[PDB]
Amino acid sequence: DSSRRQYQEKYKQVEQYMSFHKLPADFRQKIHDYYEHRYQGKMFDEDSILGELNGPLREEIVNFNCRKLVASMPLFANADPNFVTAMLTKLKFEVFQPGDYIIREGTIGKKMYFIQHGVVSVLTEMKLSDGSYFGEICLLTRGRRTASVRADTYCRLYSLSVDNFNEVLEEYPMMRRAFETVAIDRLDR
Amino acid sequence: DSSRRQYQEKYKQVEQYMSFHKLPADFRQKIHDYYEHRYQGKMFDEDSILGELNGPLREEIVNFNCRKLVASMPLFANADPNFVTAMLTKLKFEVFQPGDYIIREGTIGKKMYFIQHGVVSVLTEMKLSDGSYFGEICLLTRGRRTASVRADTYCRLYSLSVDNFNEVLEEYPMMRRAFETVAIDRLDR
Amino acid sequence: DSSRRQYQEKYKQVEQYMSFHKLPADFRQKIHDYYEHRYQGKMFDEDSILGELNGPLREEIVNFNCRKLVASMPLFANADPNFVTAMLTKLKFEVFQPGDYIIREGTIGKKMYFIQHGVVSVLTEMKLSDGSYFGEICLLTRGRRTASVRADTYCRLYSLSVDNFNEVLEEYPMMRRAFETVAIDRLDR
Amino acid sequence: DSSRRQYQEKYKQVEQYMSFHKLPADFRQKIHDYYEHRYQGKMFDEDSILGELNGPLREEIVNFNCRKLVASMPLFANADPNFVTAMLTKLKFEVFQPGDYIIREGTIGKKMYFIQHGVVSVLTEMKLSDGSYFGEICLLTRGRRTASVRADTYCRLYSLSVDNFNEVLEEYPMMRRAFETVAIDRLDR
Ligand SMILES: Nc1ncnc2c1ncn2[C@@H]1O[C@@H]2COP(=O)(O)O[C@H]2[C@H]1O
Ligand SMILES: Nc1ncnc2c1ncn2[C@@H]1O[C@@H]2COP(=O)(O)O[C@H]2[C@H]1O
Numbered sequence: 045d046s047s048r049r050q051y052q053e054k055y056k057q058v059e060q061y062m063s064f065h066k067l068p069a070d071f072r073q074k075i076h077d078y079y080e081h082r083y084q085g086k087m088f089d090e091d092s093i094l095g096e097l098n099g100p101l102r103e104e105i106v107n108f109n110c111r112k113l114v115a116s117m118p119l120f121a122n123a124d125p126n127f128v129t130a131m132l133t134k135l136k137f138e139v140f141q142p143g144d145y146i147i148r149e150g151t152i153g154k155k156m157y158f159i160q161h162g163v164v165s166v167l168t169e170m171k172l173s174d175g176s177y178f179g180e181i182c183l184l185t186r187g188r189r190t191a192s193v194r195a196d197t198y199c200r201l202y203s204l205s206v207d208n209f210n211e212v213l214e215e216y217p218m219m220r221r222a223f224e225t226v227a228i229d230r231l232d233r
Numbered sequence: 234d235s236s237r238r239q240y241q242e243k244y245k246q247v248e249q250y251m252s253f254h255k256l257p258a259d260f261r262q263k264i265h266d267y268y269e270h271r272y273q274g275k276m277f278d279e280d281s282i283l284g285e286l287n288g289p290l291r292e293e294i295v296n297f298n299c300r301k302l303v304a305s306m307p308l309f310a311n312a313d314p315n316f317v318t319a320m321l322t323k324l325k326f327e328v329f330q331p332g333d334y335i336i337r338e339g340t341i342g343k344k345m346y347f348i349q350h351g352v353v354s355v356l357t358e359m360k361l362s363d364g365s366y367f368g369e370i371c372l373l374t375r376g377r378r379t380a381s382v383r384a385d386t387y388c389r390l391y392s393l394s395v396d397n398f399n400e401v402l403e404e405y406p407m408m409r410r411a412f413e414t415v416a417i418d419r420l421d422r
Numbered sequence: 423d424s425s426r427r428q429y430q431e432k433y434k435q436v437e438q439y440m441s442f443h444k445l446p447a448d449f450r451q452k453i454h455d456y457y458e459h460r461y462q463g464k465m466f467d468e469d470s471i472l473g474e475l476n477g478p479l480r481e482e483i484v485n486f487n488c489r490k491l492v493a494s495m496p497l498f499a500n501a502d503p504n505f506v507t508a509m510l511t512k513l514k515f516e517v518f519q520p521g522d523y524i525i526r527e528g529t530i531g532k533k534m535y536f537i538q539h540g541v542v543s544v545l546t547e548m549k550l551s552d553g554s555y556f557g558e559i560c561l562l563t564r565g566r567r568t569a570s571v572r573a574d575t576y577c578r579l580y581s582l583s584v585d586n587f588n589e590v591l592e593e594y595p596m597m598r599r600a601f602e603t604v605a606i607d608r609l610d611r
Numbered sequence: 612d613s614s615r616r617q618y619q620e621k622y623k624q625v626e627q628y629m630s631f632h633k634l635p636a637d638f639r640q641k642i643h644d645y646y647e648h649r650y651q652g653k654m655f656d657e658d659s660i661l662g663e664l665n666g667p668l669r670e671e672i673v674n675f676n677c678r679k680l681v682a683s684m685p686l687f688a689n690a691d692p693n694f695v696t697a698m699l700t701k702l703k704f705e706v707f708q709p710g711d712y713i714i715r716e717g718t719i720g721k722k723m724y725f726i727q728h729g730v731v732s733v734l735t736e737m738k739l740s741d742g743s744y745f746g747e748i749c750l751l752t753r754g755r756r757t758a759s760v761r762a763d764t765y766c767r768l769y770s771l772s773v774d775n776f777n778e779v780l781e782e783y784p785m786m787r788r789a790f791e792t793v794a795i796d797r798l799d800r
């Protein structure tokens with residue numbers, strides 16, 4: 045239960061930090077809920093652990109932890125396993141809370157998001173859920189966000205930066221077509 | 234009180250460090266006073282805490298912690314909330330002590346400062362206080378400091394590097410005019 | 423036995439991490455075996471220790487820890503001691519398990535491997551063991567891997583990135599010929 | 612005595628590390644002596660401590676800790692205090708042991724050394740001591756070391772990288788002449 049204790053002590057610091065800065069009670073509970081949803085009572089120095097392993101072990105772990113995500117998207121499901129692994133390795137797990145603005149219209153976009161679980165509202169009005177992704181337009185155009193995207197419910201997502209996006213596509217150039225298709229179709233709508 | 238203990242133990246190391254290097258008694262008290270003013274008896278690995286959160290949570294925290302600063306300046310008060318947030322996110326909190334040279338005339342300037350609280354003396358003689366900023370000239374010209382700026386009283390400031398300054402303005406180009414106006418007006422004087 | 427305890431507590435976290443993510447029992451034992459083979463019951467913040475030393479001490483340590491490796495290869499054995507040291511300093515120790523894909527054919531190669539102990543199978547069928555190296559072709563061509571290389575037995579290797587490879591050769595340009603010879607000979611086969 | 616304990620526990624790890632890698636008894640005592648000379652029974656996360664301070668405090672500390680060094684050289688003694696501070700801030704304290712090769716002839720030089728205390732032998736035969744510096748030729752030519760420099764006695768030095776060297780001179784261009792004079796005079800000899 046060393047991981048449980050790590051979470052408890054770390055959360056104690058967070059609580060004291062919020063108290064020190066006199067954050068409102070409502071925000072403190074929002075923080076409380078975020079930690080439960082995001083870490084679920086346990087914490088590990090993930091970077092330290094994966095860093096002690098080797099490439100093969102790290103790739104098997106990410107492929108397993110993302111099995112759900114992978115199964116939910118034709119993008120990864122029907123692709124070269126090596127492509128999927130390269131992509132998955134670059135993903136960053138993120139949890140957003142109801143009402144959170146994940147993307148704001150008109151700003152410079154430098155990341156896209158893959159939905160593991162949750163519902164988002166795209167407003168320029170439409171919704172996207174499990175197995176869908178968004179924010180790909182700006183990674184392709186390098187322009188400004190074409191719409192705002194807010195979390196409707198709690199959202200468990202994986203983000204990918206434009207730099208990592210292009211890095212992976214350097215090795216798998218033809219996979220860019222998948223994102224472009226989705227981008228074009230949405231730009232038309 | 235884990236944060237209180239962190240401060241106490243950390244300060245113990247500092248004291249032992251100053252003793253090891255035989256720093257004068259007067260400087261040791263200056264160090265003592267600095268820690269009280271800067272951390273106020275508590276310490277947190279701020280980077281670790283904010284890093285465990287998400288973008289929305291981090292932005293709400295910085296906007297709240299800087300509410301005072303924001304209210305004191307037409308620059309931020311009357312601007313696009315997204316601009317203010319982008320700027321605030323790049324700021325670095327710093328505390329200076331009476332007599333400290335924040336900026337020395339003739340040197341290459343790579344940062345500007347926003348005054349949360351305190352009084353500074355600009356010498357090439359004038360003073361600046363709460364709600365004012367300085368050091369913007371060099372971020373705009375990339376030249377040498379046009380004057381020295383010393384802390385008159387204890388000063389609670391937020392600094393912004395030229396690189397972060399230009400990064401934010403890449404997204405909000407027109408806000409550069411605000412800094413230029415102040416710069417031009419002061420260059421004339 | 424502070425190092426033994428470090429290993430035990432660290433492994434406890436790993437085990438809890440694997441449990442948290444519900445990894446299969448078989449993979450958990452694979453992880454168990456990896457840690458035994460790689461760290462052998464002890465762990466040290468190697469980077470912190472070597473960083474407290476100086477250049478001379480670090481170089482003597484790496485030359486000693488790699489004495490076995492050096493003796494097993496004409497490349498290093500008959501070369502300028504300064505070259506060997508520069509190279510050794512850039513190496514990264516890695517342990518692979520039976521069946522592990524060290525290199526996959528057709529992918530972009532950015533590293534080569536020197537075999538301290540173990541047997542690998544090169545498949546485009548041949549094997550390489552103690553004292554041999556592989557993955558040098560892509561560091562020279564900057565192209566795609568000409569074959570896959572799987573660990574046949576447990577493998578104790580030292581990897582070298584293309585960037586560190588070229589950095590060392592900036593100081594020892596003529597040593598590139600050794601790698602080219604091996605590359606040409608294998609490309610012919 | 613938290614700093615004393617830090618040293619004791621850290622040294623315990625070092626000793627266990629050397630034992631794990633089966634380093635010879637003679638080298639283990641060399642390591643033992645190095646730690647005593649370099650840290651003197653105490654250790655602090657220097658980077659963490661100085662990082663908690665501000666620019667003014669850090670500059671006063673470095674100027675004080677290097678008071679001895681500064682007094683021993685016309686270079687710094689008769690220069691602009693701001694130049695001295697900028698330089699001192701970039702220095703890295705290093706301890707070398709008798710017989711250590713600080714610089715090897717013919718290699719690419721990327722750093723120079725200022726002697727706080729100790730004696731070095733320059734061999735292409737001459738010696739340099741307290742208040743003198745060496746390794747400046749390569750920082751100026753970007754070529755290969757014109758000679759080897761070995762520690763004759765224990766040496767307490769401060770090194771400066773070519774990059775930091777040129778960075779400081781960007782602000783103080785005319786100080787480069789001081790190093791060139793010494794370089795030219797030695798190249799003639
Ligand atoms: N009509 C749409 N249907 C679904 N998603 C959309 C639609 N329009 C825009 N989006 C998504 O909203 C995202 C906003 O940021 P981007 O412009 O980078 O990428 C956009 C698309 O991923
Ligand atoms: N006349 C003035 N009134 C107020 N502030 C000034 C005046 N002159 C210079 N300053 C400030 O002092 C700063 C010194 O560094 P900079 O030249 O970067 O920017 C300068 C201005 O921000």
Ligand SMILES: Nc1ncnc2c1ncn2[C@@H]1O[C@@H]2COP(=O)(O)O[C@H]2[C@H]1O
Nearest residue numbers: 531556557558559560567568569608611
């Ligand atoms: N015929 C061969 N005999 C031994 N090794 C080979 C042979 N062919 C390829 N290899 C090695 O397998 C490696 C696969 O990655 P690279 O192409 O970078 O470099 C290749 C060589 O190092």
Ligand SMILES: Nc1ncnc2c1ncn2[C@@H]1O[C@@H]2COP(=O)(O)O[C@H]2[C@H]1O
Nearest residue numbers: 720745746747748749756757758797800
């Ligand atoms: N004749 C000399 N007298 C004193 N120092 C020297 C002499 N010749 C070379 N050196 C120093 O030895 C250093 C070796 O590395 P560098 O060539 O970078 O710079 C050299 C000088 O700093």
